[PDB]
Amino acid sequence: ISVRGLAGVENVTELKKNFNRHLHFTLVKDRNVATPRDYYFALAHTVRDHLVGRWIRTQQHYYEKDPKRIYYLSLEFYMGRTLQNTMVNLALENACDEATYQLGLDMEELEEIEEDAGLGNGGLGRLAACFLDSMATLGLAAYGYGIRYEFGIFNQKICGGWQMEEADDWLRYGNPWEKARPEFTLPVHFYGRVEHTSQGAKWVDTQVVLAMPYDTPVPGYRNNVVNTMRLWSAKAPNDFNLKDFNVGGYIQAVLDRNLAENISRVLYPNDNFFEGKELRLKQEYFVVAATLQDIIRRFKSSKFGCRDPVRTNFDAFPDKVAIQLNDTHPSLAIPELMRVLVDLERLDWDKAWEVTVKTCAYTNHTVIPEALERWPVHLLETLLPRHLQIIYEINQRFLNRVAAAFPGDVDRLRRMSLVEEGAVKRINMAHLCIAGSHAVNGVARIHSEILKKTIFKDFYELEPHKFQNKTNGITPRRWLVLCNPGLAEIIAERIGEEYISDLDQLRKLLSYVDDEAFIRDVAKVKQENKLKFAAYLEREYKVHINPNSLFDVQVKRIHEYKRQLLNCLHVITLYNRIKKEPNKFVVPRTVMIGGKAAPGYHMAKMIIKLITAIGDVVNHDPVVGDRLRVIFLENYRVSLAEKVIPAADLSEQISTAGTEASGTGNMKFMLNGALTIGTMDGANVEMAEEAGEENFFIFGMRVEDVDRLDQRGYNAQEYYDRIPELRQIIEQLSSGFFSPKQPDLFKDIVNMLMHHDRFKVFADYEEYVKCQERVSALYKNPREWTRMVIRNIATSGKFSSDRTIAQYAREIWGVEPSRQRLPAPDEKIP
């Protein structure tokens, strides 16, 4: 059937009876009233059963051996569905497929019932998920720590072409994967005040909110390692949230508990944008405070909680603990770690600081100013009074280090300050993370250089040893074996299966680049994938597309820097050229654009309306026929990504050079047989460098060209004046050609494009359409297109998150990866 594992005789029979056990005892249903949802749950519980045994020994193991622990703190974990992925990592896919078949059910139909775990916005959240999978696969004693939002990223609905947001009630039917652990509930404090008494400061009169943990298993690829993802939930104490007496109402007091519990209610839907709301800061301290207590408790047991030097010596803390900060969201971990060590454990400042710097590491994800976290001091002052004091003290001693290094450089002092003066005083969380971490990394080579050359230049001059790079990656399990079994099978037919955990081996595929059978096969799976997607489209969304056309897809969050608008300009150009010479041949294309816009991002929402507006005109023009369709992919999310990427021919990674930190969608497309048209931005540079620029469609300004243009001054009128095709398009938008009933509907877009384009869309227009003509030319030559595809696939090995994690481990965490199978799952009950 494929190498989805063995469909053993004993195991298929075992699966079936367990499926029935659960349907009866766990779901309390009888075959006669069972719906597909019940069947999905019976299977999920059956599958979950296979990894609890491994989960328990894995954790018991780490307790016995006591290795260095890796704690990955992130406010986002974009997980997606977990049934198939669990089957894949346990080599259960074929057995379950067989078993459910014999039970008279379609496994694929049941998989579609599982709700996505959308506790993420985009790139950053998905990175955390891929990292978790790789850390388990590389056998590291790692823990994912975050917030269990009861409402994830909103579900996007398109009404009259506009995006409508609706609550993502993903827990509505239950989550069979998590395990509530109410017995490890921890208290978290807010507000209060600071008392300075005799031997130390005291955080007093605080409001207590409880953090209840939920553990979800994270299985490594076929190695019997099951790590843990602990997600905290907010709970109100039953005392003060009722006991602070003297009138108000007993009923109201109980109803008011949903005020402390709102902390974990919903995920903020902002991607690369900072919103200084109090609820957000509360979520940030909430995940940090609870997680650190858990980390320290585990450390206090280790082997020190037995003997060792005997004396809770935190000198070995850094040798047993490593906490990675996914962006500055968990930045409070730095002053909080200081607070505990100093205020509670009573260590001296300098010893505490040495420990904190040695255990914390920070990862930066963007260079745009509006994405930077700068928290108003008055907020920190009211909510976390002692942390503000600690931050001021950290700033004081840091700046003294600067003044000592650069005597007299008074401007450098203010530039580097963690405290920003002005309208309102703010705290620069990034400056905080650089100062309190022993490593700061970028997510792609060029982004990492930009950090040293620009944004964190002063910091780099002060401590060059801190700055590193760790190019992002994706997990080949979910992003290849899971979403594209057809491609994984033919690759395996030639080079084996070892590449699933050693992607570098894909290079061996280079020797089949002239193999007639392989070229036929690679091309066949892509055709099969496109047919399946074209079908899903009519099934669930309804209104036909042509599977013979080129599948041009751009899927990612809607942003001005991602330039979906530049894509739009090209689509309209193709339309206008067809209307000019109708009977002239052009390569057919289905251009699919999908992504979510933050609810408050007006421009982004205006762009989604433009996309749909173009499709209204283009898709109903009889002269155009089937040569060009514009489709907007609704509710783009992880599970939808697993469907479109394997069916894409052209991947669009066209952000303005210097704005996209790295990107990971680009890597997903490269590994699944799509050719890339993009700018020399983020990881695009490394991809092109790996596959060879000849097998890549690069266009537009390089970072240097952008800077030259800024020195000069960007004037969009110039481009409007010298390019008639561009001019024609702008006058089409301005006159209501795409919005008949509301002729001035797109005035904000035109106005912006001409007068405030921060991302110079026009400057790359000519080179973009010129470059698009070249891919059309190559698509007309099936054999050469496919041969270039093989060149990309065969060279994508470097972009596996296993390579990324192995580097973090060695160069930052100080631990050695291991592909050693844990001693089976075998029963055992001590």
Ligand X SMILES: OC[C@H]1O[C@H](O)[C@H](O)[C@@H](O)[C@@H]1O
Ligand Y SMILES: O=[P-]([O-])[O-]
Q: Are 367 and 661 in contact (CB under 8 A)?
A: yes
Of 282, 320, 526, 668, the active-site residue reads 668
**Least distance between ligand IMP and beta carbon 61 (Å):** 8
The partner in contact with residue 781, picked from a second copy, ligand IMP, ligand X, none with C-beta cut-offs of 5 to 8 angstroms by kind, is none
Q: Are 565 and 608 in contact (CB under 8 A)?
A: no
Of 117, 124, 379, 610, the one binding ligand X by CB under 6 A? 124
The partner in contact with residue 127, picked from ligand X, ligand Y, a second copy, none with C-beta cut-offs of 5 to 8 angstroms by kind, is ligand X
Of 526, 556, 609, 787, the active-site residue reads 556
Of the candidate spans 59-67, 168-176, 319-327, 464-472, the one that interacts with ligand IMP by CB under 6 A turns out to be: 59-67
The DSSP secondary structure of 244-300, one letter per residue, reads S-SSS-HHHHHHTTTTTGGGGTB----SS-----HHHHHHHHHHHHHHHHHHHHHHH
* Residue 806: partners with Cβ closer than 8 Å, 6 or more residues away: 138, 817
Residues 80-119 contacting a second copy, CB under 8 A: none
Our answer to whether residue 365 is catalytic in this structure is: yes
273 is annotated as contributing to ligand binding: no
CB closer to ligand IMP out of 722 and 828: 828
301 is annotated as contributing to ligand binding: yes
Our answer to whether residue 556 is catalytic in this structure is: yes
Of 58, 272, 324, 389, the one binding ligand X by CB under 6 A? 272
Greatest extent of the chain over all pairs of C-alpha atoms, in Å? 90
Rg from Cα positions in the chain: 28
Residues 20-39 contacting ligand IMP, CB under 6 A: 30, 32-33
3-class DSSP string for 797-829: HHHEHHHHHHHHHHHHHCCCCCCCCCCCCCCCC
Six-digit token pair at 285?
Answer: 């301290």
Residues 342-371 contacting ligand X, CB under 6 A: 365-366
Residues 648-677 contacting ligand Y, CB under 6 A: 663-666
- From CA 343, how far away is CA 385, in angstroms rounded? 13
Cα distances (Å, whole numbers) of residue 634 to 124, 156, 273, 595, 654 = 21, 7, 22, 7, 21
Q: Which residues pair with 678 in a beta bridge?
A: 653, 698
CB closer to a second copy out of 230 and 760: 230
Of 196, 199, 245, 408, the one binding a second copy by CB under 8 A? 245
The reply on whether position 641 binds ligand X by CB under 6 A is: no
Three-state SS at 326:
strand
- From CA 636, how far away is CA 644, in angstroms rounded? 10
Cα distances (Å, whole numbers) of residue 38 to 28, 222, 407 = 10, 28, 71
The reply on whether position 826 binds a second copy by CB under 8 A is: no
Q: φ and ψ at 80, to 5 degrees? A: 80, -160
Of 48, 339, 526, 557, the active-site residue reads 557
Of 4, 562, 570, 627, the active-site residue reads 562
Binding mask 519-558 for ligand Y (x = CB under 6 A): -------------------------------------x--
Of 122, 144, 330, 615, the one binding ligand X by CB under 6 A? 122
Our answer to whether residue 804 is catalytic in this structure is: no
DSSP 656: P
Of 5, 80, 123, 797, the one binding ligand X by CB under 6 A? 123
The reply on whether position 443 binds ligand X by CB under 6 A is: yes
The DSSP secondary structure of 434-489, one letter per residue, reads HHT-S-EEESSHHHHHHHHHTTTHHHHHH-GGGEEE----B-TIIIIIIT-HHHHH
- Single-letter amino acid, residue 654: I
**Least distance between ligand X and beta carbon 131 (Å):** 10
State the first-to-last Cα distance of the chain, in angstroms, to the nearest integer. Answer: 39
Angle of the 564-580 helix axis to the 602-618 helix axis, nearest 10:
20
286 is annotated as contributing to ligand binding: no
Of the candidate spans 22-30, 326-334, 504-512, 613-621, the one that interacts with a second copy by CB under 8 A turns out to be: 22-30
Of the candidate spans 116-124, 207-215, 349-357, 373-381, the one that interacts with ligand X by CB under 6 A turns out to be: 116-124
- From CA 292, how far away is CA 335, in angstroms rounded? 11
The partner in contact with residue 123, picked from ligand IMP, ligand X, a second copy, none with C-beta cut-offs of 5 to 8 angstroms by kind, is ligand X
305 is annotated as contributing to ligand binding: yes
- From CA 271, how far away is CA 124, in angstroms rounded? 9
Q: Are 120 and 78 in contact (CB under 8 A)?
A: yes
Residues 301-320 contacting ligand IMP, CB under 6 A: 301
The alpha carbon of 658 is separated from its chain's Cα centroid by a whole number of angstroms, namely: 20
Q: Are 118 and 34 in contact (CB under 8 A)?
A: no
The partner in contact with residue 63, picked from ligand Y, ligand IMP, ligand X, none with C-beta cut-offs of 5 to 8 angstroms by kind, is ligand IMP
643 is annotated as contributing to ligand binding: no
- From CA 122, how far away is CA 472, in angstroms rounded? 14
331 is annotated as contributing to ligand binding: no
CB closer to ligand IMP out of 774 and 828: 828
Of the candidate spans 54-62, 140-148, 416-424, 817-825, the one that interacts with a second copy by CB under 8 A turns out to be: 54-62
Of the candidate spans 55-63, 104-112, 509-517, 785-793, the one that interacts with ligand IMP by CB under 6 A turns out to be: 55-63
Our answer to whether residue 387 is catalytic in this structure is: no
Angle of the 36-65 helix axis to the 93-102 helix axis, nearest 10:
150
Q: Are 177 and 48 in contact (CB under 8 A)?
A: yes
Q: Which residues pair with 442 in a beta bridge?
A: 469
**Nearest to 777, CA basis, from 609, 563, 550, 502:** 550
Q: Are 703 and 657 in contact (CB under 8 A)?
A: yes
**Least distance between ligand X and beta carbon 446 (Å):** 11
According to DSSP, the β-strands at 650-653 and 550-555 are parallel
**Least distance between ligand IMP and beta carbon 30 (Å):** 5
Q: Which residues pair with 738 in a beta bridge?
A: none
Of 3, 6, 14, 20, the one binding a second copy by CB under 8 A? 20
The partner in contact with residue 46, picked from ligand X, ligand Y, ligand IMP, none with C-beta cut-offs of 5 to 8 angstroms by kind, is none
CB closer to ligand IMP out of 305 and 814: 305
154 is annotated as contributing to ligand binding: no
Six-digit token pair at 109?
Answer: 């139909």
Of 5, 80, 120, 123, the one binding ligand Y by CB under 6 A? 123
In the chain, count of helices (H) and strands (E)?
A: 32, 25
Binding mask 258-297 for ligand IMP (x = CB under 6 A): ----------------------------------------
Polymer length of the chain: 830
The partner in contact with residue 20, picked from a second copy, ligand Y, ligand IMP, none with C-beta cut-offs of 5 to 8 angstroms by kind, is a second copy
697 is annotated as contributing to ligand binding: no
CB closer to a second copy out of 253 and 492: 253
The contact set with ligand Y (CB under 6 A) reads 122-123, 556, 663-666
Catalytic site residues?
365, 556-557, 562, 664, 668
Give the binding site for ligand IMP (CB under 6 A): 30, 32-33, 59-60, 63, 298, 301
- Annotated binding residues for AMP: 30, 63, 297-306
**Binding region for a second copy (CB under 8 A):** 20, 24-25, 28-32, 35, 37, 49, 52-53, 55-56, 60, 151, 154-155, 164-169, 172-174, 179-180, 182-183, 235-236, 238-239, 241-243, 245, 250-251, 253-255, 257-258, 262, 265-266, 268-269, 277, 279, 599-600, 829-830
Where does this chain bind ligand X (CB under 6 A)? 122-124, 127, 272, 365-366, 443, 472, 660-664, 682
Q: Please state the residue numbers annotated as binding site.
A: 30, 63, 297-306
